[PDB]
């Protein structure tokens, strides 16, 4: 087991669309 996790633009892009601006719980986006 060996977790990196810092950068990922194409998962947060992809929701945007059906979801909008309103969905975001997990890491903080300002």
Do not use: C, D, M
Not at 3 to 20: F, I, K, M, P, T
Request: hydrophobic share 40%.
């Amino acid at each position: 087991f060996v977790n990196q996790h810092l950068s990922g633009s194409h998962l947060v892009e992809a929701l945007y669309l059906v979801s909008g601006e309103r969905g975001f719980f997990y890491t903080p986006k300002a």
